[PDB]
Structures are given as structure tokens and as C-alpha cells.
Design a protein around this ligand. Structure first.
Ligand code: ZN
Ligand code: ZN
Ligand code: ZN
Ligand code: ZN
Lengths: 247, 246, 246, 247
């Protein structure tokens, strides 16, 4: 029965993703329960700061979650070591910049600087990224010790998200080497259609690929020269950041 | 049924713990069987609020960032502060503004003016010079050392009025004064004939995300009105900032 | 106790009457004794909602202007429309914006984006090019003849995108199309990779005070999605405009 | 008893001048009456559009009053005949512009174009103006047939609003003539301290002073040359507008 816990986290997950607000009455009707017991969950969520109650007694998300996110981001020294180089990359390219943290066979958005114009990409901090269909991703898969690598191609599926999503490990391997060659990667609409990217890795103590920095924007912009320009500023900050990581 | 308590309580410990913790350690610390703690832990890991490392110890999960940013992105200080603003207008009768910080500029996110107050040209979604205003200067006074140093290194301090501070060094002094004063005053620095008293609104990290202020005809702003005015501002400003997690 | 009815009813007649009226005429028309009508009239004149001319005939009072402007000045279309906006987002899952007209520019007064929608750089209190957007073009389509002629005579139609209309004559055509179409569509005219469908919000005088729109990745905007999308917009737009007295 | 009418107009006057909103409960407590009878007034006010009821059942002013004001303003042809010249005067001076309608021994603000900066003046449409302590006012009192004039000085008090508010009819008369001379007036902080103005009249069919147009701003700006400049653009539009009034 103790999995009441589940119910709690379902109600909360709902208020966070809910556009606007919600009344005690509405949550009850939502999760088959009396207004009385809804108050059981809502009063604790409110007291803990996960939710804010309006003068009209309707509910809105609180600040707690915001504080929690910062605490977790606060655990990645790289974030503070890079943030400004990212803001600079955005001011010198005008393009959105991403920084993905390497976590196993997945990546996580740990920082993002929006560009001058909105781009048809759905990314946000905390979100996860496929290390194969993305530039900063392959850029990372192009330096993981061969051993670890070999296993990735062995485990991770390659469900093609777009007609350009590489689904063959022999091509992906060669692809990765090309990246080792140039020293960066390119996402020719392999992750999201309409969007292309350029990425470079970030090494740590023992030169392991612990991060990925990339420039993202609409396909139109990424020309041969543009690419050369982006990967240029990218590698420049990469090297500087990597240094801080004791490399 | 208030296990909801231990749940968020265990979640709070993990998020605020720099290192990690094992299920048994959570059990010992929060006084419960290893089987019950595995329950809180099985669900928190389930919803992604927690991550279990190879060595089995737990650390906070990525979902907290996902939720954090998603919430911050749609948080509305205006919907939260408005009534306080209206209130500020009931105890002073002078128009009131709320300014949001947008880098090195401020945005007017709300304004409560009374029938008796001065009609102002300022309107929602209008830029605010951070250096020539009380709310803006209040925001500057608390900005992080490095950022303020930067502000002064890039922003042009135009002479819009005879009183406008135009010397970065003279301004930094003003801020250090405001910083210690607790509030700022616009002595016809933004506009001629108009004065303002402004305080900052802090977020949970203590960052000056915005400022509230009172604007009126210069004359009305006497040493005693200002002290009177400011006090009202902070009072309502603490409430707002507290609701932001401060 | 519903004499409150005849009162505003008599007030309504006077305000909407181009000429004047005497107490006896109000009595005859609204079926009452000359003494009772003098009562409604004594109070309306009292509160200044009515003025008695030298020839004794009555005409509307200056207070109606005083109240009118005081109310207009603080009317908040955003507080009025917001929930509708949230609603627009529940039936389309695509971010939604509300744009206020500020002369020849538009101001973003609100935006409801969903977890599934495209993260947009646009934010409250940000300028909107009226010629390169769906909400903005919707506002143009209904602007008063003389004003639009003027708009085209002073505004620079920059080529921000390959699709942006830059020919005043070509634009006026688009508007006449939108005017008759009932809504507007931003075919990657504002930004590349993004499309929008937008309708106007009218005030009581039929003036396009603002516009609501749906924004999403260009691809998603198919002939059927657009028709689907627009319909939702007007539905919610009529409600808003109706609450503005339209 | 029928003066329930009074109560109605007191409640309404209150919601209009009330910052924020009000609940049925609050109005009742405000005007000593049961929530039940408050609904009597609030339901009609709502049905007539004078008030708007929120989802939270709290009340906010409606659009009706806005519509009513326009209808009354709609009765002064001069308004539409001048409005643009006013917008032009503001764009060519950067100063706030006013247009007061002559109504007996008082004036009424019938149009106003705000300037680039907020000025310490409290003016709004519909408001009334003393025809003696204001520029557009004296500018009008400088052309009213002497007969009518003589009576004004005879009736209207001159309660000095500021150390510069003329309280002597002999000085006011001479003052007025100076105005007839120059062809315009000047408010050296005679109406409001901190504020100075420059005004010119607007004549009708039989050349009667039916209106007043003026430029308003902080005292600092009104220099000998500035004044000359303002009264220049002022008289220019005046003449043009007056023409339309069949003059
Ligand atoms: Zn990428
Ligand atoms: Zn200020
Ligand atoms: Zn658009
Ligand atoms: Zn004046």
C-alpha cells in the first residue's frame, strides 16, 4: 500500500506539465479520490514547496523543483567551467549552443544558451540525448576507448529517427573515425529534421570523453564555410574547457 | 498515510547531499526497515528523481533538472506578486512598478497606478535602463561581483537627465550604498520631475531577479516619505522573494 | 428593487442618443410618472453621468469619459484571455502567443508553451514585427484604411527571411487575403523552420487590438492542420473579443 | 427609497477606482448589506457589462464604460478634426499635447497625446480644467466676448493653486490681453508646480473660443526659444483646425 508514493509523484508530475493551474477538486476527479484525500497530497506538496496555492485556492508549481534542479546541476563542475564560453560561442555565432554530459551510453543536456532566433528543436536541460544521432553525441563516441565503444554498437539500438539517422554500426564506426579525423562531428539532419549541428568533445583527467559541446540551428545555415567556422569556435572553447578538466 | 513526508524528506536529503547514500544508510538515518527504505528508493528511482550508481550508492537524478528548468521557464513572478503590488498602491497611493531583469536591461512586467497617482508613459514590455532607475539600481546592487564588473564594462551610461550617474566608478559607489542601504532612490535620474524608491526581489539563490518601486512627483519624495515608502517596499518584497524560495 | 434596470436603461438611451432628451420625454418613453423619471435623472446628473443644458434638455456627461479612459487605461486583455490561451494549448499542444498592438509594432503580452511544443526565444515584453507574423498580419488586415495606408508608407519591410514579404503592394494583397480569409499564416516569414496561424482580437469598436496564434515546426503545418488550427483560434478569439464588448 | 440608484452608482464608482478586483463578499461588507443583496447590484452591473466577473468569482471593471466614453467623445467633431495634428505636434516637439473643450467657465480634457517621457502632471480625458490657471485655459479666456468675460472674472474664484496662480482679476485681465497680443498663453507653474505650458485657441463658425490646444512638460524645457518654438507649431495646427470649425 505504501506505494501511495506513486500517486503522490503522479499528481505532482501532472501539475508540473499542466499548462495553467489546478484546483483540489480537479485533482481529486483526476485521480479517483475524495477532495478530502486530495488535500492529503496537496497539503504536503504545498508545505514542501513543490506547489504554490493561489488566493483563488487553485494550484501552481512551486519553487522547490527549481531549487532541486540547480542543486543537481551544481554537481557538475564542468557546467560552471564552461557556461561563459558557451555564452561567448552564442554571441560569436548567433546560434544556439548545447553542452551534453556523458552518462553511460546516453547524454544529458546540462546547459544551453539560446540563440537570437527560435529553432525548430525541442531541447531542455535534464533531457536525454542519443549519442549516435547527435553531433555532440558522436563527437563523444569518437573518443570512448575502443573497448567501451565496441560494446556500445553492440548494445544500443539505432532506431532511425530521420532518413539520415545512421542505422549501420559499420558506417557508424567509419563515421566515428572520420570524426576522429576532422576532430569534430556533423549532424546532417540525423537527429532532427530541419536541424543540423556541429560538435566537439571535452576531455577530462585521463582524456576520456565526458562531455559534448555543439552549435545547433536550422539546416539552411550550415554551409561548408559556416561549418568550418562553427567547428572552429567550438574546438577553441573545447580545448580551453577541456584544460580545466585537468587535460 | 503521511509516508509522503518521509518520501520527500529522503528526496530532500539526497538532493542536498554532495556525496551519495545506500538504501541501508537511508534506512538507518530515517529510522526504518531496509525493506521499507527500498520502497521509497524503488519509487524515487522509478520516477527518475534518483539514480543508482554501479557501486549501488544513490545520487540525485536528471529528472530534477528536467522538472527544474521546465518549471523555471514558466514561473510567473507577476502572477505571484501582482496582488502585493496592488497592496503597495493601497498604502501609498503612488503608482507602482515591477521590473524583471533581462540581462543588462529591465522589463516592466507590471504596474499598478492609482487615480491620484502620476500618469506614466511606462508600459508592460518596455525596456528599463538598469543604471538610471531605483528598481534597476536595486537589481545592480545585488548582481554577482563578476557580473556587475561586467555590466560597468559594457553598458553606456547615457546622460538622459542632469542627475543621471554617468561615471561607472561613481555608480559602483551608489550601488555599494544601495547594497548597504537596503533600497535605492531615483532622484530624477530617470526622468525630470519624478522620483522613485526601489527594492530588489530575490530568488532562492539570492539573485536579484527583479525589483519593485514607487514613483511620484519629485517634490513628494521627502526624507521621511522615502523612509516611509521603502519600508513598505521591502515588506511586500520579502513576501514575494520568500514565495520564490528565498 | 430592480429599478437598477430602468436606471442604466435610461443611461444607455442618453449615451447612444445623438441629440438630447427632457425629463418628460424619458418619462413617456420609459413608461413612468414625471416625478419618478426626475428621480433617475436627478441621480444621473448628480453623479455627473448626465448634463442638463440651458434649455433643460439632457445630454451625456463628462464623467462617462473620465470613467471610460480610466478603465481603458487599466484594462488587461491578458488577465482576460490567458485561460483561453491555456485552453488553446490543450487542444493543439502547440505553443501559443498573444500579441498586443503598440502602434506599428506588436508586444508579446502572453505565451503558453507545452512540454511537447517548440521552445521559443520570444518572451513577454518583446517587440513583434507586425508585417512578418501571423498575429501581426492579422492585426494589419483589420487596421483602419487610413492607418494601414500609413503603415505601409513608413515601416521598413526587412528581408529577415527568404519568405518575408518586402513589397508593400504584395503585403497589402496578403492582408486583403487574410482580411477575407479570416486568419493569417506565417509561412516561415518570421523565422526559418517555424510557421504560425494567427487571428485578430477585436475591441468594442471592431479595432484589432491584438492577435492570438499557434506556432510550431513548419512541417507540422499542413493544409489540414492549418484549417484545424485556425478554427480553434477564432473560437477562442471570439470569446475574448466578445468580453471586450465586441 | 428609489435612491437605491445612489447605492448602485457608489458601488460601481468604487470598482472603477479600485486597484485590482473585488468579491461579492467584500462589496457587501463595504456597503453594509447581505451578500444576497450585493448580488442584486452586482448581477445587474455584470449583465449590463459595467463589471466583469472572474473565474475566481472576483470582480473587475467591464468594457461598457469604455464604450460609453467613446460615444460621448464621439459627440465632439473637433476631436477627430484635431487628433492627428496633436499626434504630429507631439512627434515634432516630443512633448505631451492637450486639447481642452470649452464648457462654460470650465474646460474639459477631450484628447491627449502622451510625450516621450512621463511628466509630473495628473491629467486624463474627461477631467475638468480651470480656465485661468492653465495656458489652454487663459488662451480661451483671451477671446471670449468681453461681455461674457467680464462675468467670468465676476463669478469664478481664483483659489491660488501655486505661488504663481494669478489671484487678481485686474492682473488676469491685463494678462489675458498680453495673450491677445502674442496670440497665445504661457503657464509659468500657475496650474501645477514643476509643469509649464504653452497654449493657443481654436475658433468656430463665428470665431468663438470653443477649444484649447497646448503643449505641456516640465518647467526646465520651456526656454524663451523653446516657448517660441512650441507656440509656433501650436498656432500652426490651431489655424488649420480652426479652419475646419468653419472659421
Ligand atoms: Zn546536436
Ligand atoms: Zn525609477
Ligand atoms: Zn508568427
Ligand atoms: Zn496647460
Amino acid at each position: 500500500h505504501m506505494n501511495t508514493l506513486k500517486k503522490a509523484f503522479e499528481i505532482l508530475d501532472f501539475i508540473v506539465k499542466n499548462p495553467g493551474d489546478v484546483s483540489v477538486s480537479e485533482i481529486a476527479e483526476k485521480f479517483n479520490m475524495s477532495v478530502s484525500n486530495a488535500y492529503k497530497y496537496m497539503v504536503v506538496l504545498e508545505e514542501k514547496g513543490f506547489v504554490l496555492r493561489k488566493k483563488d485556492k487553485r494550484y501552481v508549481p512551486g519553487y522547490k523543483l527549481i531549487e532541486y534542479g540547480s542543486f543537481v546541476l551544481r554537481r557538475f563542475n564542468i557546467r560552471d567551467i564552461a557556461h561563459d564560453h558557451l555564452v561567448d560561442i552564442m554571441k560569436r555565432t548567433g546560434e544556439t549552443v548545447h553542452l551534453i554530459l556523458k552518462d553511460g551510453f546516453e547524454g544529458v543536456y546540462i546547459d544551453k544558451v539560446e540563440g537570437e532566433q527560435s529553432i525548430p528543436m525541442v531541447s531542455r536541460l535534464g533531457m536525454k540525448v542519443d549519442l549516435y544521432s547527435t553531433a555532440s553525441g558522436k563527437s563523444i563516441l569518437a573518443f570512448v576507448p575502443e573497448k567501451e565503444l565496441k560494446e556500445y554498437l553492440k548494445i544500443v539500438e539505432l532506431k532511425p529517427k530521420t532518413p539520415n539517422t545512421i542505422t549501420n554500426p559499420r558506417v557508424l564506426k567509419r563515421e566515428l573515425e572520420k570524426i576522429r579525423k576532422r576532430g569534430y562531428a556533423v549532424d546532417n539532419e540525423e537527429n532532427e529534421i530541419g536541424i543540423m549541428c556541429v560538435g566537439v568533445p571535452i576531455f577530462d583527467h585521463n582524456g576520456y570523453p565526458v562531455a559534448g559541446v555543439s552549435i545547433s540551428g536550422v539546416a539552411r545555415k550550415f554551409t561548408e564555410e559556416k561549418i568550418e567556422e562553427y567547428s572552429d569556435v567550438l574546438k577553441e572553447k573545447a580545448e580551453e574547457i577541456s584544460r580545466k578538466l585537468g587535460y
